[PDB]
Design a protein around this ligand. Structure first.
Ligand SMILES: Nc1ncnc2c1ncn2[C@@H]1O[C@H](COP(=O)(O)OP(=O)(O)NP(=O)(O)O)[C@@H](O)[C@H]1O
Ligand SMILES: Nc1ncnc2c1ncn2[C@@H]1O[C@H](COP(=O)(O)OP(=O)(O)NP(=O)(O)O)[C@@H](O)[C@H]1O
Ligand SMILES: [Ca+2]
Ligand SMILES: [Ca+2]
Lengths: 174, 341, 222, 116, 280, 167, 398
């Protein structure tokens, strides 16, 4: 079936009903310190090509919600990297997209509100916002090393080809 | 005035006392009772109990009881209790299908004609609180197709497939008593054969007694109509039609008969006691792909109001699934050259 | 509640005290004579052929007709078909001419998966097992012949009444026409094996095989 | 199972048991062994065939309904013995006998238990 | 398709595929095929002794000795030459193609292989066409039993060669449909006067024929061929047509019956629309 | 084609008279309902059989009864080719008898095709329309047997000439 | 007899024809007929079938068979004419014929087929075999020592896949189930994947390309991520090239072939990838079908899952079905043991060589046996008892 996250510890913290997982990142955010060598962002970029094709996804733990969120974000990144003409350009174009304020759980525009709990108060609200942007930035960075082939100006068609495919038929821009 | 209840044959029908409800059998083991609301027909009751098609229905007016008989050999008497009809089984003691049924005018008895070549005269014994029946067998040789009672509730006319129209006595001293004499005879013990037509052809599809019961008429499959006059030594008047067999007949006066059948339209017949002759009075239905109201054979015709003495409206139901209501006066206008008695 | 080997008496109790009750269910058929209130244990025989045997035999026939029914997976479906379309032929020779020369017997039956099948001659052929066991590889004489013997075996003075008091019992005897076939069968036997062939006394032999019109819950009513 | 080969129904006591224009009027008189019947139908068949296609409607219309019915029972009989134009002419006799007797005259051909 | 093809597609296509793979340098696959042809013919294509580099094509005609008495062997040698090898047990003629020694153009050999059957037939015709072309008359007639219950009779004369087929109709109705067809051949010259004259005798054999059978289902067709057909220019074509006739005739009797069927399906379909339009 | 119109007319009128049916439960078998013209186990329920012949070859036999009618037709077959085409065509239809609810699987002995019209048909369908169908049928089979005959000869000539021209 | 029987297997898209006894069909052609489009003269004869009828400039291509069942009889009949008289070159009056029928073919259709074969072609004998049984028979060639006609056939052509339970040679009709995924669906899918990534592929040849790729490169993998990984990691080892020629240009066009290779066949197991209305993995439908069959025959069905169809050709397809089904079934018995020890169920998926023409192969083997001649309807019986005899066709071969 679809691929689930395996980074859900009994002592894992919850931001809303998503999982507040670690992330190797030079970007600011409420993300805990990296425990091992593979963070949630690694699982998303990894399982992506096989997950994006699915329409249904059985949510098991809050780690799945973080996974699903990043997955959907990769789709956003590719729709940008697609029109790029250099890794540098992409690196820059991603920062801007990560800084963009996409809708979050509870907001009209955020698909899947019936699955993602809404922040219960202004504090959890600011944390969640920060986290999501943090993930967006890190993900958009790594994904950039991938999409671009050692021969710059070449956004690999092996990533660009998925631009029109939406995980669970859902979208952060739709 | 035509109305389609369905596109399948209305096997038979019966109207209550005030002609407010009509019981029909839509080619099923069932009987649907319809009632009008404004100018629309609405089904108010569905009587389910027979295990075969219902071939006959009769509604006793005053006691308001519906009697039905089917091909399942059974007969049920339905009694309205509150808002539902409850059936009571009546064993006719036959091993073939019941073909027709009529309550006697006095509602103390009901007769059922069947494929066992007999007629079952049924009545109730309060003593043992159930229904019983005696058989009228001789000289019936084939299936009894139609029955009609004489006003004295004793004489019974029958038409069967042995090409005969006969009048019997269904005298049951256990529910009524000594019948007064009649031109049909003075001896009316149970089963006595009072009259038997002398035809050798044509199944007798329908039989009818006139208002005063001194005349009995019947229609046969050889496309003829007949009338035996008891006041003229039981002489029989005959009239051969140029068209198809009539399946149902009734008197609308003491000298006028209306009938319908395979031609699909009602026709008028008049009797002249003087000459002792019958005459064709013409088509009463003047304008699939037919010029007639009914689209298939008409198989039952009944008097809706005015009695058989001076009928003012009659009803017809046929194999087309339609039921028509004919206004005698209206008909006498659309046709100025009509003659009724 | 006493199945033979007494419901037969219960049934008869209809208003009769002496008669023969041919009861047939799913698994077994019995012929239970009953005299003046009690059931004579002897004279009561069993017929190894009932409702399951017909329901099964139908499956075989429907196979030859081009319909593939699994005996296990579809036994219930065919039983419902049997109950609804099957009947006992009166004169097999004449029933077969109808099936072979006309189509008046063909009837449609919608299966649970929406498919519509057509059944014809097998509607009277399946129940024919009861009369000709050899059709379902069962050795015997068939419910009819059995009845005749079972009566022609009992006392002489009691046969007259018996013959005019045979009464069907059990669901497997609800087949349309069954009573008539039996009455025609006994008359053929009586003619051959009792009147020796004097087709001039056959009219004095009175048979009366009744199919109880009041019958859904007789055992009790009894 | 030989017993089952005799039609016991034959002895059942319930089985039913039955109990030129001048030339035409001439032949239609006193109608009835298939010998006497055939002899009868032949005399009438003889007269019908001996008619002109324009002298039929005049002879048919000169008969009372009972006569027409009889003519129709004979016309149908004619149909069972084709030979020459006898059938092309009979079909003309049918046309006229029908317009006069109506389909009902045919009904009485089918209904007759004792016919020609 | 009106005329029956003369070549055999299974033979041609099998050889073709094998030769193709041979040319491509591919490794040889094993081949084992059994098939038939009209008139009780049976073929076998195989690798003699399991040697996948050798493909053998064999034909079996129950009536080969007959064709052999009329030059078959000689003709077959002329056509196939060194491809002709001793006949496989159960067959009369065998062609062997060495996958490792094929010609530049495989076209002719494949085409010729496909015509094995027709070539086994050709000799009896060339023989008698020659008799006429040399005016050598009085020569005995050739009797070929091409089917278990059918016979062909070749016979030369001063200015013509006649071919008589004794054919059988297993279907009684096929005789009637066959007669309609024969009738049109009988009159075939009306639109082609230079064409062969066909004759037809329904139950009895033409006088010219002996132990010839007689029956309601038998039929005798005669073809009168003239020099213009039997000379060294028309010859092959004449043979290609004349030897497929009997099958040509039955093939058309059968296709007619199929055509009748499409008619009956349409007429019945119409009838059912009416009946149902009679439903309220 | 002079005697045709008169023939059908007589046939149609006889069909009018005969198709006057009603539902009739068996007098012989408890709870059975069969077409009397087929079983004939009750003589009083059978009408007198009648025939309408156009000539010595063409004719229609009409057998009526209280609840069903059997109509048999003797189809025109001039020569052998019409004979086999006719026999073939009638067989094609009899094999499909179940779609032709009124068709008989086998003809009455002596005829080419037969119909069995029951009260159930005269109820499910307008009887006058059924009477038109039989007449329509008679007309249309003839036209069909003719077209088929021409189709056979038509293809015959083309086939004979396609072979002869090539020599 | 000396002449071998004729064996014809008519599929919706392809017909397999040849003589009994042979290992493979002598011809495998497109189940189509091209005609000119009142029929007069010899017009009915002007047609072509199979390949020769696909691009005929002045003829209309027709497909007399829909969902494995004959729809157009007039056209199916002519098709047969050439099958017999042009390709097989068989005298129809001399060969017995074995034809096949999809499950759920009516007895009426059998009589129509019989009418054509006996009354148009005069065949001496006919047998209509049910495709699923022939498939079960073709598998006795494989992993199997004891042959049986009880098993689960998984037929997949270009239309709709079928999961058919067979017990003792008779299809259990009431338990058949169909899957909205087959060859055509896979092609349409592979096509998109290509349209999204590659360029140069002539639109007029979008399909041809897809189908070519599906048949020459596709296969079933054991795990998506790992396969996706492999291609992205060692692309060199898994990315294949595919060249072609344009129609109106003839200019050779090249494209790379990737994910579609294993993604294409994957929709059998994860239908939701391409079908928005169907989601059951094939392994679940099979499991469900068998559960609906009589209990006393369920284990036999699980031990004998046999394949048939060009769509079951994908490499390891059967191995992936077994694994998946072994789980779906083991998982179930894992709960029944908690809510309380049923013997483990043996799930086996047989795979053999003649899988594209499995049915034809089985018909060829059965048609070349003596018993075949014993259970065929002869021309005499057809004419003495009627076409009704062709309704039933005795199973045989055990
Ligand atoms: N209307 C019917 N027509 C024909 N067979 C029927 C009918 N109804 C039930 N059956 C069959 O009769 C048998 C059932 O008999 P039933 O009257 O239920 O007795 P029971 O209480 O089940 N005891 P037994 O019948 O011996 O199992 C089964 O074979 C039913 O399929
Ligand atoms: N090597 C292959 N790999 C994958 N698919 C193939 C291969 N070869 C053929 N096919 C597919 O096989 C399918 C046709 O199979 P086939 O069994 O002939 O169908 P049919 O039987 O013609 N149709 P149906 O009546 O539903 O069985 C097409 O989708 C082909 O693309
Ligand atoms: Ca019971
Ligand atoms: Ca297939």
């Amino acid at each position: 079936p679809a691929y689930h996250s395996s980074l859900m510890d009994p002592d894992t913290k919850l931001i809303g009903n998503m999982a507040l997982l670690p992330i190797r990142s030079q970007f600011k955010g409420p993300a805990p310190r990296e425990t091992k060598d593979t963070d949630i962002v690694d699982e998303a970029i990894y399982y992506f090509k096989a997950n994006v094709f699915f329409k249904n996804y059985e949510i098991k733990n809050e780690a799945d919600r973080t996974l699903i969120y990043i997955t959907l974000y990769i789709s956003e990144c590719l729709k940008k990297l697609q029109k790029c003409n250099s890794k540098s350009q992409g690196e820059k174009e991603m920062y801007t997209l990560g800084i963009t304020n996409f809708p979050i759980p509870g907001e009209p525009g955020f698909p899947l509100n019936a699955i993602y709990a809404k922040p219960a108060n202004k504090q959890e609200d600011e944390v969640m916002r920060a986290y999501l942007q943090q993930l967006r930035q890190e993900t958009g960075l790594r994904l950039c090393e991938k999409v671009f082939d050692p021969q710059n100006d070449k956004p690999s068609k092996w990533w660009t080809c998925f631009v029109k495919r939406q995980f669970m038929n859902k979208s952060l821009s739709g | 005035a035509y109305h389609s209840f369905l596109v399948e044959p209305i096997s038979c029908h019966a109207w209550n006392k005030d002609r407010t409800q009509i019981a029909i059998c839509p080619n099923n083991h069932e009987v649907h009772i319809y009632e009008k609301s404004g100018n629309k027909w609405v089904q108010v009751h569905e009587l389910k109990e027979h295990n075969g098609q219902v071939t006959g229905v009769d509604w006793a007016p005053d006691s308001n009881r519906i009697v039905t008989c089917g091909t399942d050999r059974n007969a049920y008497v339905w009694t309205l209790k509150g808002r539902t009809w409850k059936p009571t089984l009546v064993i006719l003691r036959i091993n073939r299908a019941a073909r027709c049924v009529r309550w006697a005018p006095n509602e103390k008895k009901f007769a059922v004609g069947s494929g066992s070549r007999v007629i079952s005269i049924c009545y109730f014994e309060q003593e043992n609180d159930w229904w019983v029946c005696k058989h009228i067998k001789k000289p019936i040789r084939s299936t009894v197709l139609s029955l009609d009672w004489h006003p004295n509730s004793v004489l019974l006319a029958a038409g069967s497939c042995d090409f005969k129209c006969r009048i019997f006595s269904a005298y049951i001293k256990e529910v009524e008593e000594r019948p007064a004499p009649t031109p049909w005879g003075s001896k009316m013990p149970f089963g006595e054969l009072m009259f038997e037509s002398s035809s050798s052809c044509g199944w007798v599809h329908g039989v009818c007694f006139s208002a005063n019961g001194s005349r009995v008429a019947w229609v046969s499959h050889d496309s003829t109509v007949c009338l035996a006059d008891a006041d003229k030594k039981m002489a029989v008047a005959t009239l051969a039609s140029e068209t198809l067999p009539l399946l149902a007949v009734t008197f609308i006066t003491e000298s006028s008969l209306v009938a319908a059948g395979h031609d699909c339209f009602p026709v008028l017949f008049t009797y002249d006691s003087a000459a002792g002759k019958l005459s064709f009075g013409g088509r009463l239905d003047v304008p699939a792909g037919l010029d007639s109201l009914h689209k298939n054979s008409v198989s039952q015709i009944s008097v809706l109001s005015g009695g058989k003495a001076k009928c003012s409206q009659f009803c017809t139901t046929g194999m087309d699934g339609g039921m028509s209501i004919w206004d005698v006066r209206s008909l006498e206008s659309a046709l100025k050259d009509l003659k009724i008695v | 509640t006493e199945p033979p080997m007494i419901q037969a008496v219960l049934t008869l109790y209809q208003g009769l005290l002496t008669g023969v009750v041919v009861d047939s269910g799913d698994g077994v058929t019995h012929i239970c004579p009953v005299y003046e209130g009690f059931s004579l244990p002897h004279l009561t025989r069993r017929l190894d052929i009932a409702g399951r045997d017909i329901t099964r035999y139908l499956i075989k026939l429907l196979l030859l007709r081009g319909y593939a029914f699994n005996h296990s997976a579809d036994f219930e479906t065919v039983r419902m078909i049997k109950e609804k379309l099957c009947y006992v032929g009166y004169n097999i020779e004449q029933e077969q001419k109808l099936a072979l020369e006309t189509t008046v017997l063909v009837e449609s039956y919608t299966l649970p998966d929406g498919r519509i099948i057509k059944v014809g001659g097998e509607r009277f052929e399946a129940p024919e097992a009861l009369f000709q066991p050899h059709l379902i590889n069962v050795e015997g004489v068939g419910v009819a012949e059995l009845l005749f013997n079972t009566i022609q075996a009992a006392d002489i003075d009691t046969r007259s009444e018996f013959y005019k008091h045979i009464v069907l019992s059990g669901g497997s005897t609800m087949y349309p026409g069954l009573p008539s076939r039996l009455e025609r069968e006994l008359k053929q036997l009586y003619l051959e094996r009792v009147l020796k062939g004097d087709v001039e006394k056959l009219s004095k032999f009175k048979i009366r095989i009744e199919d109880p019109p009041r019958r859904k819950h007789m055992v009790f009513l009894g | 199972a030989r017993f089952r080969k005799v039609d016991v129904d034959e002895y059942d006591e319930n089985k039913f048991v039955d109990e030129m224009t001048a030339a035409l009027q001439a032949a239609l008189k006193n109608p009835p062994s298939q010998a006497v019947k055939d002899r009868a139908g032949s005399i009438v068949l003889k007269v019908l065939i001996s008619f002109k296609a324009n002298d039929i409607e005049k002879a048919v219309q000169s008969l009372d309904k009972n006569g027409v019915d009889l003519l129709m029972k004979y016309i149908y009989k004619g149909f069972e013995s084709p030979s020459d134009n006898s059938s092309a002419v009979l079909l003309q006799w049918h046309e006229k006998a029908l317009a006069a007797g109506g389909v009902g005259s045919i009904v009485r051909v089918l209904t007759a238990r004792k016919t020609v | 398709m009106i005329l029956l093809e003369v070549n055999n597609r299974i033979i041609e296509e099998t050889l073709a595929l094998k030769f193709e793979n041979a040319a491509a340098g591919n490794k040889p696959e094993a081949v084992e095929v059994t098939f038939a042809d009209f008139d009780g013919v049976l073929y076998h294509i195989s690798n003699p002794n399991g040697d996948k580099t050798k493909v053998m094509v064999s034909i079996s005609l129950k009536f080969y000795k007959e064709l052999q008495a009329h030059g078959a062997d000689e003709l077959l040698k002329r056509v196939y030459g060194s491809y002709l090898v001793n006949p496989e047990s159960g067959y009369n003629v065998s062609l062997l193609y060495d996958l490792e020694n094929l010609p530049a153009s495989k076209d002719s050999i494949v085409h010729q292989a496909g015509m094995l059957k027709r070539n086994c037939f050709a000799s009896v015709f060339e023989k008698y066409f020659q008799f006429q072309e040399e005016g050598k008359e009085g020569e005995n007639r050739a009797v070929i039993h091409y089917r278990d219950d059918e016979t062909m009779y070749v016979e030369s004369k001063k200015d013509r060669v006649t071919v008589v087929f004794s054919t059988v109709f297993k279907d009684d109705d096929d005789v009637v449909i066959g007669k309609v067809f024969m009738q049109e051949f009988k009159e075939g010259r009306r639109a082609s006067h230079t064409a062969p004259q066909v004759l037809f005798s329904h139950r009895e054999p033409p006088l010219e024929l002996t132990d010839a059978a007689v029956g309601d289902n038998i039929g005798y067709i005669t073809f009168v061929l003239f020099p213009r057909h039997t000379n060294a220019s028309a010859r092959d074509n004449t043979i290609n047509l004349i030897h497929t006739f009997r099958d040509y005739l039955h093939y058309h009797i059968k296709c007619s019956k199929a055509y009748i069927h499409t008619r009956m399906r349409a007429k019945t379909s119409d009838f059912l629309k009416v009946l149902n339009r009679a439903r309220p | 084609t002079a005697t045709l119109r008169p023939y059908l007319s007589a046939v149609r009128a006889t069909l009018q008279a005969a198709l006057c049916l009603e539902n009739f439960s068996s007098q012989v078998v408890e709870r059975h309902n069969k077409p009397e013209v087929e079983v004939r186990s009750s003589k009083e329920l059978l009408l007198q059989p009648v025939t309408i012949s156009r000539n010595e070859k063409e004719k229609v036999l009409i057998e009526g009864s209280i609840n069903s009618v059997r109509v048999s037709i003797a189809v025109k077959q001039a020569d052998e080719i019409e004979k086999i085409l006719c026999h073939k065509f009638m067989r094609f239809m009899m094999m499909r008898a179940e779609n032709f609810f009124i068709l008989r699987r086998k003809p009455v002995e002596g005829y080419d095709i037969s119909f069995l019209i029951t009260n159930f048909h005269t109820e499910q369908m307008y009887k006058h329309k059924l009477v038109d169908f039989v007449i329509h049928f008679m007309e249309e089979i003839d036209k069909e047997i003719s077209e088929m005959k021409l189709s056979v000869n038509a293809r015959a000539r083309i086939v004979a000439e396609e072979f002869l021209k090539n020599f | 007899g000396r002449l071998p029987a004729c064996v014809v297997d008519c599929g919706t898209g392809y017909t397999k024809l040849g003589y009994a006894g042979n290992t493979e069909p002598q011809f495998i052609i497109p189940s189509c007929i091209a005609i000119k489009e009142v029929m007069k003269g010899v017009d009915d004869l002007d047609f072509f079938i199979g390949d020769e009828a696909i691009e005929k400039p002045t003829y209309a291509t027709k497909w007399p068979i829909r969902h494995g069942i004959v729809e157009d009889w007039d056209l199916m009949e002519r098709f047969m004419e050439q099958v017999i008289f042009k390709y097989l070159r068989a005298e129809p009056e001399d060969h017995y014929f074995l034809l096949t029928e999809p499950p759920l073919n009516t007895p009426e259709n059998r009589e129509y087929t019989a009418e054509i074969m006996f009354e148009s072609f005069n065949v001496p004998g006919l047998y209509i075999a049910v495709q699923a049984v022939l498939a079960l028979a073709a598998s006795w060639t494989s992993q199997v020592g004891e042959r049986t006609l009880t098993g689960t056939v998984i037929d997949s052509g270009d239309g709709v896949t079928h999961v058919i339970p067979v017990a003792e040679g008779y299809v259990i009709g009431s338990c058949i189930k169909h899957i909205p995924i087959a060859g055509r669906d896979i092609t349409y899918f592979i096509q998109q994947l290509l349209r999204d990534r590659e360029v140069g592929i002539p639109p007029e040849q979008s399909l041809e390309t897809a189908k070519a790729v599906k048949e020459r490169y596709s296969y079933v993998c054991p795990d998506l991520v790992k396969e996706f990984n492999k291609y992205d990691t060692d692309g060199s080892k898994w990315i294949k090239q595919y060249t072609g020629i344009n129609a109106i240009s003839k200019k050779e066009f090249s494209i790379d072939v990737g994910y579609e290779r294993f993604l294409g066949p994957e929709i059998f197991f994860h239908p939701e990838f391409a079908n928005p209305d169907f989601t059951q993995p094939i392994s679940e439908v099979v499991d469900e079908v068998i559960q609906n069959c009589p209990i006393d025959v369920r284990r036999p069905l699980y031990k004998n899952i046999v394949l048939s169809g060009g769509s079951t050709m994908f490499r390891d397809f059967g191995r992936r079905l077994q694994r998946d089904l072994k789980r779906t079934v083991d998982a179930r018995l894992k709960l029944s043991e908690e809510l309380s020890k049923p013997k483990p169920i043996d799930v086996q998926v047989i795979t053999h060589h003649m899988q594209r023409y499995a049915v034809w192969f089985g018909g060829s083997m059965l048609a070349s046996t003596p018993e075949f001649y014993q259970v065929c309807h002869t021309k005499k019986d057809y004419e003495e008892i009627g076409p009704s005899i062709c309704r039933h066709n005795p199973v045989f071969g055990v």
